[PDB]
């Protein structure tokens, strides 16, 4: 039997992500910008954006 006669206090590190950046995107400003005609075309696609 091998038995230890001494010891070491070891401090190790563990890194864990917990959160990511909260991002919001408006369709009408991404797909259409300031175009009202583009928005009128886009609203024919339904509730994709909600």
């Amino acid at each position: 039997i091998a038995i230890p006669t001494n010891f070491t206090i070891s401090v190790t590190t563990e890194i864990l992500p917990v959160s990511m950046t909260k991002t919001s995107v408006d369709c009408t400003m991404y797909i259409c910008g300031d175009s009202t005609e583009c928005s009128n075309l886009l609203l024919q696609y339904g509730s994709f954006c909600t």
């Binding site: 024919q44 696609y45 339904g46 509730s47 994709f48 909600t50």
Partner: protein
Amino acid sequence: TLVKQLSSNFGAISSVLNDILSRLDPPEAEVQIDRLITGRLQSLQTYVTQ
């Protein structure tokens, strides 16, 4: 949200498949029906992924 999106045109002249079908000739109705099919496939795929 899936049941709705059956009332969306997706760019066609109507969301009712029969109205497009019984109000245009075949070669012109095919594009409209294809547009509806594409939109509804996209909606169903979004549902399944979610």
